[PDB]
Symmetry: D2
Subunit: 337 residues, 4 copies
Amino acid sequence: KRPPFVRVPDLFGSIMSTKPVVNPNYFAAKARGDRWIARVMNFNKAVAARNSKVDLCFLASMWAPDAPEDRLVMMLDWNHWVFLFDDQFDEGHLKEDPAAAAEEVKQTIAIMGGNAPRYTAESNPIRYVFQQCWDRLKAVSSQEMQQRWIDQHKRYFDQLLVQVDQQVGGENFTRDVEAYMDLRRGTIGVYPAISLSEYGAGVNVPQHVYDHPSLQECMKVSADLVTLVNDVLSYRKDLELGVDHNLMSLLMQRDNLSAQQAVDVIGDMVNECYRRWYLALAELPSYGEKIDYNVMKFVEICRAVAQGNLYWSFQTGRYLGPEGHEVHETGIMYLPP
Amino acid sequence: RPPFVRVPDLFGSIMSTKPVVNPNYFAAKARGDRWIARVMNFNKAVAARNSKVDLCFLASMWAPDAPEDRLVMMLDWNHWVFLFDDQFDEGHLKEDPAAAAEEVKQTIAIMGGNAPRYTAESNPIRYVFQQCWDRLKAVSSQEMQQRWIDQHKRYFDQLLVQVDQQVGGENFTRDVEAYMDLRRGTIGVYPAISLSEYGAGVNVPQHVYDHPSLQECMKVSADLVTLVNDVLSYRKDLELGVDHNLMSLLMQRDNLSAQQAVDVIGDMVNECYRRWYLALAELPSYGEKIDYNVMKFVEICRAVAQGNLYWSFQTGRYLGPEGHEVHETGIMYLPPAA
Amino acid sequence: RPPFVRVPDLFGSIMSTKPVVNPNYFAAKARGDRWIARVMNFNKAVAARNSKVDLCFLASMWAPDAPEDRLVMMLDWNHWVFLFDDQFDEGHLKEDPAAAAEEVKQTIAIMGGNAPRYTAESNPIRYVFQQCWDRLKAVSSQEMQQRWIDQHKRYFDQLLVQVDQQVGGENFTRDVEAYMDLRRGTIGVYPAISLSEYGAGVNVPQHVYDHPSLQECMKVSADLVTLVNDVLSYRKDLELGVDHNLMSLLMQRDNLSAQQAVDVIGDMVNECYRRWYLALAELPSYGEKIDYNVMKFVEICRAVAQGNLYWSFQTGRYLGPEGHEVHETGIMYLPPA
Amino acid sequence: KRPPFVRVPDLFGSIMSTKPVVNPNYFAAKARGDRWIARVMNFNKAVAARNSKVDLCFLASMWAPDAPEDRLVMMLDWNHWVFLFDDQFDEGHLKEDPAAAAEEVKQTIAIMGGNAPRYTAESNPIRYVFQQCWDRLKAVSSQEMQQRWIDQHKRYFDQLLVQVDQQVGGENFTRDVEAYMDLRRGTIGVYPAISLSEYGAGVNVPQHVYDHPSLQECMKVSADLVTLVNDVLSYRKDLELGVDHNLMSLLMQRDNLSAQQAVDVIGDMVNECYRRWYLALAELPSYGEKIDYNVMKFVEICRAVAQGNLYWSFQTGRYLGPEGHEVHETGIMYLPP
Ligand SMILES: CC[N+](CC)(CC)Cc1ccccc1
Ligand SMILES: CC[N+](CC)(CC)Cc1ccccc1
Ligand SMILES: CC[N+](CC)(CC)Cc1ccccc1
Ligand SMILES: CC[N+](CC)(CC)Cc1ccccc1
Ligand SMILES: [Mg+2]
Ligand SMILES: [Mg+2]
Ligand SMILES: [Mg+2]
Ligand SMILES: [Mg+2]
Ligand SMILES: [Mg+2]
Ligand SMILES: [Mg+2]
Ligand SMILES: [Mg+2]
Ligand SMILES: [Mg+2]
Ligand SMILES: [Mg+2]
Ligand SMILES: [Mg+2]
Ligand SMILES: [Mg+2]
Ligand SMILES: [Mg+2]
C-alpha cells in the first residue's frame, strides 16, 4: 500500500495524446492575472511567487486556446477563485462544517444574478473574484449562456455539500466507487470549467443541443478524466494534507488494494473513459453544418478541459512541480515513507 | 426527372469543422499545373480548364502542413489518379477487360516490378505515376512503400471488377452493398490516404494500421467520398453516360426518384459518421508516442473525406461556380435530359 | 522589337519575404466573384475569365488577417477599381476630359455627397463603389472616412490629369518624373492602402499618418506597383494601344531598347527599396501603443506592393500561366508586331 | 544621484513595438531544459525554481520562434551556459583575475573543435554545457556556419578579457561612453546569440552577404539595444552585486548626470539605435530573391534577439521579477533607498 514508488498508467493516451494547443496570450494574461490575484489576496513576495509557480494560467490557456487576452485573464481569475474556493472545503474551514458550507454556497450562488452584496477585495476577497468574473461573463453572454454558467456552478456547489456530508458522516470510506465518482463529477469543477471555456471560446451551442445525452456524457467523461488524473497526481498532497477524497485512498482503504493495484484501476477507468467518449459521440445527432461546427468546438472544449488539466497536473507547483515531468517520462511516481 | 433536388447537408457531423488549406497551395499549384500540361500536351484551353479542376485545392486539404515539395508530388498524383481513372470510366478501358487488366498489370509493375523508365513521350500517364512512385520511394520506409503498393492494389483491383460488371450487364443488378464495396476501391481513397501519409509524414506501425478500427476509418472515409461524389458528379455521369453512381442505381434498381435517392445518400452519409465514432471506440491505445501519430492518421482519413467534400463543391470538373450555390442553397439542378 | 526580354529581379529585398495570404481567400473569392458577375451581367465566359483575373488573390495579400466579410468588401472594391479604371485607359472616358471629370464628380459624391442610391440596374460600377463605401462608413471613424475619401481623391485627380495628357498629346513628351507623378495616383495604391486600413483594422492617428516618413512609404509602395505593373502589364498595353507604360515611354523618349528599358525599371525598383528604408529612418516614435499600429501600417504599405507583385505574375489579366514562367526563368516574351 | 525611482524611457517603440512571437515549443523545451541544467549544476529545489523563474527559455523562444523543439532546448542550454558563464566574469572569481579569465576563454574556445578534453557535468559543468551545445551546432551546421559560430563567440570572449583588464586597471569610470559600448557590444553576448539563432531558425546566409557592413551594423544595433535595455533593467542587480559595468553607473560617476538624467541618455541612444537600423538596411544590397529571403529572416533575427531580450528583461526573476510588468506599464522603476 505504501511502497517507495507506484507505476503510473499512461495518462497521455488516446484523445489525450495530441500536442496541446496553448493560448498565445498566456504570457500577457499570466502577468496580469498573477499580479492581480496577489494584490487581491494580499499575497506577499513569496506567497505570490508560490502561486505564480502553480501557473493556473497554463491551465486556462489550454482550455480556450483562441480566447482573446481579456477573456483569458478572466479565465485565470476564475481559476484562482475555484482553487482558493475549493480549498475551503478540502483543508479550510468548511471541511467538517455542513452549516457554514451550505451558507458559503448560498452566498456564492446569489452573486450570479441574485441578492448578494457588492463585494470588495477587502470585504470578502474570494467572493469578490468570483463576482468580478460573473460580471464579465454576464456582459458578453446570452441570458441562456448565463443560465448555463449558473446551473453548472450549481452542480459543483451541490456536490461540495454532499462532500461535507459524507465527510462528517464518516462515509468517506464507506461510499463505493460509483458514489465517489458521482461526487467528484461535481466537486472536480469541470462542469463550470467547461462553461468558463465556452465563454473564453465564444461558443454557445443551443441549450437543446447541449442537453443531448451525448454531449452531457462528453462533459461527464471529461470530468472523470480530470478526476482520475487529479487523484493520481495530487495523491501526495492528499497524504500531506489529510484529505480522504481521492480514489486511490478509497480503493486501498475500502477494497484492500495495494497502492499499485489502485493506480492500475485508475488506468482501467481512464481508458474506459476514452471508450465512453467515442460511444457517446456516436449518438450525437447532427443539427446541420452551422451548429455542428460549434458542437465540434464544444466537444473540443470538453477534451481541452481534460488535456489542459492533464498537462497542467504534471508540472504545477501545487502537486509535484518539476518532478512531474520525470513521472511523465518514466511512469514512476515516488511516494512518501 | 426533376429540374433540381434538395441535397442533404453534407457538411455535418465531423465534416462541419473549418477546413485547413496548405499555405503552399499557390506555389505548388502554379508548378504542378504547368507540369501536367507539359506532360499531357494540354493546349491553352485544355490546360486552363484543368487548372480550374484545381486538384491542388484537393491535395492542399489532405495534408495541410505538407512542405511544398511533397505537396507538388501530391498534385502530381492527383492529376494521375484523374487521368488514370477516366480511362476506366469514359475512356478506352471502360468496356475492355483485357485492356484494363493489362493497364493495371503495367501500372503495378511501376512500383518495383519489371517496368521500364517511362517518359512523358513514351507514356504520359504511366510517367506521372512513376515520378510519384520515385519520390514516394526516396523518403519512405520499406513498410510504407509496401503499404502504398497494397493500397493502390485495393484500388486497381476494384477497377477490374468495375469493368467486369460494366460489360457483364451488372451495373443495375448489383445491390447497394455490392456497389459500395466496389466504390470503396474505385474511389481511390485508399491510395489517397497513402498519398497523404506521405505528404503529412505520418508513419504508423503496420500492426497498428492493420487494426480493424483504423481499417474501418479508412472504410468510412471511402464511403463518405463515394457518397459525396455520386451526388456532385451526378451531372457528369449523366452527361458522359457512366452508370457508376449510387443515384442512378437507387433510381433504376429500386424505383426511387432523384430526391429520394439523394435523401438515401444523406442517410448513408450520416450513418458514416456513426460508424466513424463507433470504430474509434474500438481503437486501442499503444502509448502516448504511437497514439499521437495514430491520431494524426485518423485525421488524415477525415481530411481526405473533407478535402474531397470542399473540393467537389469547388471543382469545375463537376459543377464549377454553381457548386458554391449548391452549398449556399441546397438546390442542385439537373439537366432536362429530354 | 525583341522576341523576349530578361526581366530584372522584382522579388528582392522587402519583396522577397514569403507572402501571407488571407486564409479566407477561397470563401471570399466564391462570394465576390459570383457577386460581381451578377452585377455586371457577365455571361459564363466573361465571368470565368474574371474569376481567372483573381482579384481575390490580390486582396487576400493586402490584408491577410481581415475577416471574411472585409475581404469580400476589398474584393468588391478591387472589382470596382478595375472596371472603373478601365473606363479611363481603353473605355469611354479615355479621351474625354468633360465626361471623365463628370464621372469623377459623380463617384466622389457617393461618399457622403449628393449621390443617388445607385443600383446594379441604374449604374453597376457606381453601385459597387457605393456598396463598398457603405461598408467602409459603418465601421470606420469619421477621420478614417475622410482619409478614405482623401486618398481616393488623389487617385481620381491624376485620372483627370491622365485624360488631359492623352488629349494634349503629351503621352510621350512628358518625362519620367512627370510620369511617375501621374502613376502614383492613377495606380490606385493610395486608396488601396485606405482599403487595407479598413481590411486590417488599423487606424493610425492622422497627425502620425501625415508624417512625411509614412507618406514616402506610400509613395514607395505606389512606385513599386507602378514599376511592377508596367513590366507585367506591358503586353496588354501593346494589345490595347494604351500609352501609359514606363516601358513604352522609355523607348520613345530615350532611344532605349526593350531590354535596357526593363533594366531601368529594375534600377528604379531597387531605388524604391532605398527610399523605403531612408524614409523609415525619419519615422519618429509615438510610443509603443501607436508604434504598434504604425508598424502594421508600414506592413500594409509593404503588403500592397508585394501582393500586387505576386498577383501581377498570376493573373489572367496580364500573362496568366506564362507569368509563372517569367518568375521561374526571368524571360518575358514580346509580340512580333 | 540616488533617487527613489526613475522614469525609464519607452523601451518598446519603433521596431520593438510589434507583438512578440513566442515559440510554441516554449513549454516543452523549458520542462526539458530547466530540469537538465538543474541536474548538471546540482541545483536544489529552491535554486532550481529560482532558475525556472529566470525563464531563460522565454528569452530563446523569442529569438527563434519557429525553431523545432530540439533546437529550442539547445538554445535554452546555451542560455543557461551564457549566464553561468558570464557571471564568473561579473561577480565570480574571474571578475578581477586577468590570468584566470584568459585561461577560461582559452579552455572554452578550444571546446569548439580544438584540443579540449571531453567534459562531463562532474568534471566541469559549465564547460560541459557549452560542449553539449557545440556538438549539436556542429552536427547540423555547415563548416562555414560553424566557423561563424566560433568567430562570434570569440568576439564575446575577447571583450570579456577587456572587461577584466579595465576592472583591475581601474578604468571602469575612466572609459568613455564609446569605449563602454564598444566593450559591451562584445560582453553583452548578442553576437554569439545571433549565431545561436541562425542555428535555431535554420537560416544560413552566405558569409559574403553576412560580412556586409549593413548586416554587421544590424548586429551592432541589436547588440547596443540589448546593452541599453540591459543596463536599465539590471541596474538594481548591478548595485546590489557591486558591478561597475553599467551605462547608468558610468554616466553619473563619469560625467555629471543624475540617475534620471542617466536613463535619459539611454533613451536617446535607444532611439538613435532605431535610426542606425534603417540607415544600415538602406545600404544593404540585394542578392536576388532566394538569398534576400534568408537575409530578411536574418535581419529579423537581429531584431528578434533585441526584442526577445526586451520582453524577457521585464519578466525575468533575475532582474525585477513581477515588478517589471509594473515598470512596463508605468515607466517607473524604483531604486533601493
Ligand atoms: C475543484 C477544482 N480543481 C480540480 C483539480 C482544483 C481546485 C481545479 C480544476 C477545475 C476545473 C477543471 C480542472 C481542474
Ligand atoms: C477515382 C478517384 N477520384 C474519385 C472522386 C476521381 C479521379 C479522385 C479522388 C481520389 C482519392 C480521394 C478523393 C478523390
Ligand atoms: C487602379 C489600377 N490598378 C493597378 C494594377 C489596375 C486597375 C489596380 C490596383 C490598385 C491598387 C493596388 C494594386 C492594383
Ligand atoms: C551577457 C549577456 N546576458 C545579458 C545581456 C547575461 C548572461 C544574456 C544575453 C545573451 C545574449 C543576448 C541577450 C542577453
Ligand atoms: Mg475539492
Ligand atoms: Mg483539494
Ligand atoms: Mg486532488
Ligand atoms: Mg471512376
Ligand atoms: Mg469518373
Ligand atoms: Mg463520380
Ligand atoms: Mg489599365
Ligand atoms: Mg490606369
Ligand atoms: Mg497597366
Ligand atoms: Mg552580469
Ligand atoms: Mg556581462
Ligand atoms: Mg547587468
